[PDB]
Amino acid sequence: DLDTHFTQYKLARPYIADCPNCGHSRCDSPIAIEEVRGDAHAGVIRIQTSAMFGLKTDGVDLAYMSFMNGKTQKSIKIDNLHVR
Amino acid sequence: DLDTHFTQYKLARPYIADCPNCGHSRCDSPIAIEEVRGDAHAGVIRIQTSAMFGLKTDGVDLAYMSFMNGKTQKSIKIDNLHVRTSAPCSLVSHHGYYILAQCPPGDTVTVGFHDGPNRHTCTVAHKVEFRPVGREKYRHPPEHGVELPCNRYTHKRADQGHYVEMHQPGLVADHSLLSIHSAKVKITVPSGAQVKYYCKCPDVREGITSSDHTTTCTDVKQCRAYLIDNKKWVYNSGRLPRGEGDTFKGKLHVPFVPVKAKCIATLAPEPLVEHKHRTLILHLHPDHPTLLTTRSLGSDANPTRQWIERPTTVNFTVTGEGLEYTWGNHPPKRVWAQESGEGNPHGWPHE
Amino acid sequence: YEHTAVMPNKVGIPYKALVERPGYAPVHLQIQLVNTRIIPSTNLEYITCKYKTKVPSPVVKCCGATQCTSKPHPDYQCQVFTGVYPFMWGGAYCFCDTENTQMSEAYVERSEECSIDHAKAYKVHTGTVQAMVNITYGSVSWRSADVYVNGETPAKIGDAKLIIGPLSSAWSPFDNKVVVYGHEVYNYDFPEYGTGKAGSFGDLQSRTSTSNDLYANTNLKLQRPQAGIVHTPFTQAPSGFERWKRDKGAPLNDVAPFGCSIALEPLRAENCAVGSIPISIDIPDAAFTRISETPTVSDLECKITECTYASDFGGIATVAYKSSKAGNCPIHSPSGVAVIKENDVTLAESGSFTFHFSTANIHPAFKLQVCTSAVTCKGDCKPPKDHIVDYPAQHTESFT
Amino acid sequence: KAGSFGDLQSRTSTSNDLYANTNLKLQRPQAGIVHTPFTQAPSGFERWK
């Protein structure tokens, strides 16, 4: 877990979003899924959350998770994420 | 929370009932799901667990969790509870012994907390459905398309609109009920209940009574482990018999009645209301079964049934006073007659 | 004088008919019939709605013969089972251990959905209720009030006591037995309360949704629990209310005749789009305009100056009127052959005066009854662009 | 050439411009949700084999 192309990371902030479906009565999640790239013929998926995990605003690690709570970040660990 | 229907709410005790599929395809647990209600046209199901989450016996919070271990409560946090269907629900509110939860559709209902001497979960089959109000056929509505007037259960609690009889709860198994009074087998109450107790040995067994008691025949299996409620009511179930004799009245509302709301709802991707001369050609582009049907506005009825889930230009020969066209339970179209051809001149050098 | 009119019932959109008056000069009488409904005398036979096997606690008696006794219900479905004995935390609710018999009982009780957005049966007798009708006229402009469409004395509203139908438009697109349900309203046969069937409509037959009585042939079959402990399965045939989205009895707001569409209603079929209503009116002789106050307009000629074929009232036609007196002139095509929207068109001796209309004919060979002088306002009109919008105002309807 | 070959028509790889008659139809993101659902006809790399 390390961050090198600050093209995406530094020049970004997590952007709050609303999940498209999350039951009948939706949960608002700033990790709302656009641009699924699961069209690999393998079984592996790249997902785009609307959240900018990666850095907090620091210099290192994709090991954090900066999603939006408010207009402000919430820079915590990425290990609570579970793609499945 | 609300105590404006402490009729059910306050006066509700944790109720114990057999599980039919569990840890050997059978276990003893409090939970066991009766009256699953996927009868709404929405996404939400009103469920009765046997266990009485809600308050404890007080008035405060639907976010406690009182199930039966023994005949006694176990009034703890609701954080060990998992309501689920075939996937985890999100709670809406609990009131009494009844929980309303926005659940994904599911063939079964699967509740469970490991707080017992065992796995202590419970599963049972019970039919859940959601479908369009008239016309169309879907199960659970899409995440796209129009919102439209579904039945759906409340976002709130302590309501009423219908009532099911909940007149006397009674006997359920649990030998904490039938303890021993140091020789003879002894009935107990949940929190106070009028118990019309008796055993196989001759005794009175009718009347509104806690004057019926039999100690003559002794054994927990030869006697009626009861909570005859009438001030601690639980919803009536198949795994909750009543005393053989007269009912103790206790008809009680449901505080989770179906109300209108804007459901995420049913309407398959947009139709095209096309027309030529006395004909609605209808280019259609749905992704889901939409009951298209039309009605030629003459004294002809012109019924139609055709599921459209296939993109199709269809036709309905519009009579001389128009046709109406009813693209699912999405709003009716209406169409006059005269002819068209989509803005074709029929002649136009003026006289 | 007495304004006969074959003149359908369309939405509410303004469309005309014409009083051919012979003693005095003709006067228009726009009979725009907004809706008609029937509302026969009726009786609530039973609410239906998809069941819920909402068990009202079993009558059990594990000693000897198990009993089934209904408590505030007419019936209780109860089925004995052996080979099971109650355990739910140990002990047993059964009160004989010398007879291990287990009485599972489950009855159907009305769903909460029965109250709201539900099927609701009726025995429908004989229609008795009015039709909403606009009358604009050439001496009163507009009144849109309900006036009987059947025999029990039609009211006089406007310069027109108007007898509508009987029951033309919404004749009764209902059957004798009717269920009405939200969107799709079903004119569908089913038997009265007490004898219903699970697969057919009226599986649940509760006299009222609230009421603690019903007839529940829902094909409720309890199955025998196994493994030596009690449970109560509900095995039930497909509902007679989940049909209404699959099986059809006739979804009348999508298959109605008479142009009418339907909703949860007490046997009304609102907003018709045919009727060919024979309205017959008693307009007082005074309300007419004289054939001296209005000229004999003959020696006229009418030619469109931009007709519009559509229910769109943009159609115009100058008429080189030639008056033998001169004055005002209510106009309309003879009782619909086109819909004219000028109440009155002025007439002078050797002048020319346009009126407005919409063609209810492909080309405008519609007579225009200019208060004792008919005239064909011939020519040709604007494209028929339209045939996807409401219910027409091109009265004479049978092709428009 | 939507729903066939040339539904996507890019004259450069890793496109920044193309001609896309793919039969792209947006639908309502019901219940106050902010998202874009894309309903699109299958392509010349989803079948035609």
Coordinates of C-alpha atoms in Angstrom, one line a residue, chain B residues 16-18 20 25-30 34-41 46 68-70 116-117 120 124 126-127 129-137 139 149 151 153 161-165 167-176 178 198-200 205 219-225 235-247 249 251 254 256-260 273-280 291 293-305 307 318 320-322 324 326 329 332 334-351, chain C residues 8 10-11 13 50-63 67 69 71-73 76 84-98 102-105 109-117 171 181-184 186 209-212 225-232 234 236 241-246 248-261 270-276 301-307 309-312 359 361-364 376-394 397-400:
Chain B
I16 CA -41.3 -18.7 23.0
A17 CA -42.0 -20.9 20.0
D18 CA -40.5 -24.0 18.3
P20 CA -38.8 -26.0 12.5
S25 CA -33.7 -29.1 11.3
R26 CA -35.2 -28.3 14.7
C27 CA -34.1 -26.5 17.8
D28 CA -35.5 -24.9 20.9
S29 CA -35.3 -21.1 20.7
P30 CA -37.8 -18.2 21.4
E34 CA -45.3 -16.3 12.0
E35 CA -47.3 -13.8 10.0
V36 CA -44.7 -12.6 7.4
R37 CA -46.5 -10.1 5.3
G38 CA -45.2 -9.5 1.8
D39 CA -48.6 -8.3 0.9
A40 CA -47.5 -4.7 0.2
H41 CA -46.7 -3.7 -3.4
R46 CA -44.2 -6.6 8.4
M68 CA -37.3 -15.7 26.0
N69 CA -34.6 -17.6 27.7
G70 CA -36.8 -19.4 30.3
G116 CA -28.9 -19.4 23.9
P117 CA -27.2 -22.6 25.0
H120 CA -30.1 -20.3 18.9
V124 CA -38.8 -20.8 8.5
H126 CA -43.0 -17.8 4.6
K127 CA -44.2 -16.2 1.5
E129 CA -44.3 -10.8 -2.5
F130 CA -44.3 -7.3 -3.9
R131 CA -46.0 -6.6 -7.2
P132 CA -47.4 -3.6 -9.1
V133 CA -50.8 -2.2 -8.2
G134 CA -52.8 -3.6 -11.1
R135 CA -51.5 -4.1 -14.7
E136 CA -47.8 -5.0 -14.7
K137 CA -46.1 -8.1 -13.1
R139 CA -41.7 -9.0 -7.9
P149 CA -49.0 4.6 -5.6
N151 CA -49.1 -0.1 -0.8
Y153 CA -46.0 -0.2 5.3
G161 CA -56.0 0.8 10.2
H162 CA -56.7 -2.9 10.5
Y163 CA -56.7 -5.3 13.4
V164 CA -56.2 -9.0 13.6
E165 CA -57.7 -10.8 16.6
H167 CA -57.5 -12.6 21.7
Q168 CA -56.0 -14.8 24.3
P169 CA -52.5 -16.0 23.8
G170 CA -52.1 -19.2 25.8
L171 CA -50.0 -22.3 26.2
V172 CA -46.6 -22.7 24.7
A173 CA -43.9 -25.1 25.8
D174 CA -41.2 -24.0 28.2
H175 CA -40.8 -25.8 31.6
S176 CA -39.8 -22.5 33.2
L178 CA -44.3 -25.1 34.7
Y198 CA -55.2 -27.0 34.3
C199 CA -53.9 -30.5 33.7
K200 CA -55.5 -33.7 32.3
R205 CA -61.3 -25.1 32.0
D219 CA -45.8 -33.5 35.4
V220 CA -44.9 -30.5 33.1
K221 CA -46.0 -32.7 30.1
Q222 CA -49.4 -33.5 31.8
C223 CA -50.2 -29.8 32.4
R224 CA -50.7 -26.6 30.5
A225 CA -47.7 -24.4 30.4
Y235 CA -49.8 -11.9 18.6
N236 CA -51.6 -15.2 18.2
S237 CA -49.7 -18.0 16.4
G238 CA -49.9 -21.7 15.5
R239 CA -47.2 -22.3 18.0
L240 CA -49.2 -20.3 20.6
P241 CA -52.4 -22.3 21.4
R242 CA -55.1 -20.8 23.6
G243 CA -57.0 -22.4 26.4
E244 CA -59.6 -24.9 25.1
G245 CA -62.5 -23.0 26.7
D246 CA -63.6 -19.4 26.1
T247 CA -61.5 -16.6 24.6
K249 CA -61.0 -10.8 24.3
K251 CA -58.5 -8.0 19.5
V254 CA -51.5 -3.7 13.7
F256 CA -47.7 -1.2 10.7
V257 CA -50.7 -1.0 8.4
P258 CA -50.2 -0.5 4.6
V259 CA -50.2 3.1 3.7
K260 CA -49.6 4.9 0.4
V273 CA -47.1 6.7 -28.3
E274 CA -47.0 6.7 -32.1
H275 CA -49.9 7.0 -34.4
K276 CA -50.7 6.6 -38.1
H277 CA -54.1 6.7 -39.7
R278 CA -56.6 5.3 -37.1
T279 CA -53.9 3.1 -35.6
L280 CA -51.7 3.4 -32.6
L291 CA -48.8 -5.3 -19.2
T293 CA -53.3 -3.3 -23.0
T294 CA -55.5 -0.9 -24.8
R295 CA -59.2 0.0 -25.0
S296 CA -60.8 1.3 -28.2
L297 CA -62.9 4.2 -27.0
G298 CA -66.0 3.3 -29.0
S299 CA -68.7 1.1 -27.5
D300 CA -66.3 -1.7 -28.5
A301 CA -64.5 -2.9 -25.5
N302 CA -61.3 -4.0 -27.3
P303 CA -59.6 -5.8 -24.5
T304 CA -55.9 -6.6 -24.8
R305 CA -53.4 -8.5 -22.8
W307 CA -46.8 -8.7 -21.7
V318 CA -58.0 2.8 -33.0
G320 CA -63.5 6.3 -34.5
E321 CA -63.5 8.2 -31.2
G322 CA -60.0 7.1 -30.2
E324 CA -56.8 4.6 -24.8
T326 CA -52.6 1.7 -20.6
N329 CA -49.7 0.7 -14.0
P332 CA -53.1 5.8 -18.9
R334 CA -55.6 8.5 -24.2
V335 CA -55.7 9.1 -28.0
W336 CA -58.4 10.7 -30.1
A337 CA -59.4 9.4 -33.5
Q338 CA -59.5 11.1 -36.8
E339 CA -56.4 9.6 -38.3
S340 CA -52.9 10.8 -38.5
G341 CA -49.8 9.7 -40.4
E342 CA -47.7 12.0 -38.2
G343 CA -48.3 15.4 -39.7
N344 CA -49.1 14.3 -43.2
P345 CA -51.1 16.9 -45.2
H346 CA -54.5 15.5 -46.3
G347 CA -54.9 18.5 -48.6
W348 CA -54.2 22.2 -47.8
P349 CA -54.5 24.7 -50.8
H350 CA -57.3 26.8 -49.3
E351 CA -60.6 27.6 -51.0
Chain C
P8 CA -71.0 11.6 -28.0
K10 CA -65.8 12.9 -24.7
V11 CA -63.5 14.1 -22.0
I13 CA -63.0 19.2 -24.3
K50 CA -54.9 -11.5 -0.8
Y51 CA -55.1 -13.7 2.3
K52 CA -53.0 -13.8 5.4
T53 CA -53.2 -17.1 7.4
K54 CA -53.2 -15.0 10.6
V55 CA -53.5 -17.8 13.2
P56 CA -56.0 -17.0 16.0
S57 CA -54.3 -19.2 18.7
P58 CA -55.1 -23.0 18.4
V59 CA -57.8 -24.7 20.4
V60 CA -55.9 -27.7 21.5
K61 CA -56.7 -30.6 23.8
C62 CA -53.8 -33.0 23.7
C63 CA -55.7 -35.3 26.1
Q67 CA -61.0 -30.0 19.8
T69 CA -63.6 -24.4 18.6
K71 CA -63.5 -17.9 18.8
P72 CA -65.0 -14.8 17.2
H73 CA -64.8 -16.4 13.8
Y76 CA -61.1 -22.4 12.3
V84 CA -44.8 -34.5 17.3
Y85 CA -45.0 -33.2 20.8
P86 CA -44.2 -29.6 22.0
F87 CA -40.7 -28.5 23.0
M88 CA -39.7 -24.8 22.7
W89 CA -37.5 -24.6 25.7
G90 CA -38.3 -28.0 27.1
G91 CA -41.6 -29.0 28.8
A92 CA -44.7 -29.2 26.7
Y93 CA -47.8 -27.2 26.3
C94 CA -49.6 -30.5 25.8
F95 CA -51.3 -31.5 29.0
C96 CA -51.4 -35.3 28.4
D97 CA -48.2 -37.3 28.1
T98 CA -50.4 -40.4 27.9
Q102 CA -51.0 -32.2 18.7
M103 CA -53.7 -29.8 17.3
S104 CA -52.3 -27.3 14.9
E105 CA -54.9 -24.7 14.0
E109 CA -58.1 -13.5 8.7
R110 CA -58.2 -10.5 6.6
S111 CA -54.9 -8.9 5.6
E112 CA -54.3 -5.3 6.5
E113 CA -54.2 -4.7 2.7
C114 CA -58.0 -5.7 2.7
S115 CA -58.7 -2.2 4.2
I116 CA -56.9 -0.3 1.5
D117 CA -56.3 -0.6 -2.3
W171 CA -74.2 2.3 -20.2
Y181 CA -59.6 -2.5 -7.4
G182 CA -57.5 0.7 -7.6
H183 CA -56.2 0.6 -11.2
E184 CA -57.7 -2.5 -12.8
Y186 CA -62.9 -6.1 -12.7
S209 CA -62.2 -6.2 6.0
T210 CA -62.4 -5.1 9.6
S211 CA -65.1 -7.6 10.5
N212 CA -63.9 -10.8 12.2
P225 CA -44.3 -31.1 11.3
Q226 CA -41.6 -33.6 11.8
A227 CA -38.7 -34.5 14.2
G228 CA -41.0 -34.9 17.2
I229 CA -41.8 -31.2 17.7
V230 CA -44.8 -29.0 16.6
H231 CA -44.9 -26.3 13.9
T232 CA -47.7 -25.1 11.7
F234 CA -49.5 -23.0 5.7
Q236 CA -52.1 -22.4 0.2
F241 CA -56.3 -11.3 -5.7
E242 CA -52.7 -11.8 -6.9
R243 CA -54.7 -12.3 -10.0
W244 CA -55.5 -8.8 -11.1
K245 CA -51.9 -8.5 -12.2
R246 CA -51.7 -12.0 -13.9
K248 CA -57.6 -11.2 -15.8
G249 CA -61.4 -11.0 -15.3
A250 CA -61.4 -8.0 -17.7
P251 CA -59.3 -5.1 -16.4
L252 CA -61.9 -2.5 -17.2
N253 CA -59.8 0.7 -16.9
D254 CA -57.8 -1.0 -19.7
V255 CA -60.6 -2.8 -21.6
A256 CA -63.7 -0.8 -21.0
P257 CA -66.3 -0.2 -23.7
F258 CA -68.0 3.1 -24.0
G259 CA -64.8 5.1 -23.9
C260 CA -65.0 5.3 -20.1
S261 CA -62.1 4.6 -17.8
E270 CA -66.0 8.2 -15.5
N271 CA -64.8 10.2 -18.5
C272 CA -66.3 8.5 -21.5
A273 CA -65.1 8.8 -25.0
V274 CA -68.1 7.6 -26.9
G275 CA -71.8 7.8 -26.1
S276 CA -73.4 8.9 -29.4
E301 CA -70.9 31.3 -49.5
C302 CA -68.4 29.8 -47.1
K303 CA -64.8 29.0 -47.9
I304 CA -62.1 28.1 -45.5
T305 CA -59.4 30.7 -45.0
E306 CA -57.4 28.2 -43.0
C307 CA -59.3 25.2 -41.8
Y309 CA -58.6 19.2 -39.2
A310 CA -58.1 18.1 -35.7
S311 CA -60.1 18.8 -32.6
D312 CA -57.9 22.0 -32.7
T359 CA -63.2 19.7 -38.4
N361 CA -64.6 15.6 -41.1
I362 CA -61.4 14.8 -43.0
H363 CA -62.0 17.8 -45.3
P364 CA -64.4 20.5 -44.1
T376 CA -70.7 24.2 -46.7
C377 CA -67.5 25.7 -45.5
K378 CA -65.6 23.6 -48.0
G379 CA -61.9 23.7 -48.7
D380 CA -59.1 21.8 -47.0
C381 CA -57.5 21.9 -43.7
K382 CA -54.3 21.5 -41.7
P383 CA -52.7 18.1 -41.5
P384 CA -54.1 15.4 -39.2
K385 CA -51.0 15.4 -37.0
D386 CA -52.8 14.1 -34.0
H387 CA -54.4 10.9 -32.9
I388 CA -52.4 10.5 -29.6
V389 CA -54.2 13.1 -27.5
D390 CA -57.2 12.9 -25.1
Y391 CA -60.8 12.2 -26.4
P392 CA -61.8 14.3 -29.4
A393 CA -63.7 17.6 -29.9
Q394 CA -64.7 16.6 -33.4
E397 CA -67.7 11.0 -34.0
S398 CA -67.6 7.7 -35.7
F399 CA -64.3 8.2 -37.4
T400 CA -63.0 11.4 -35.7

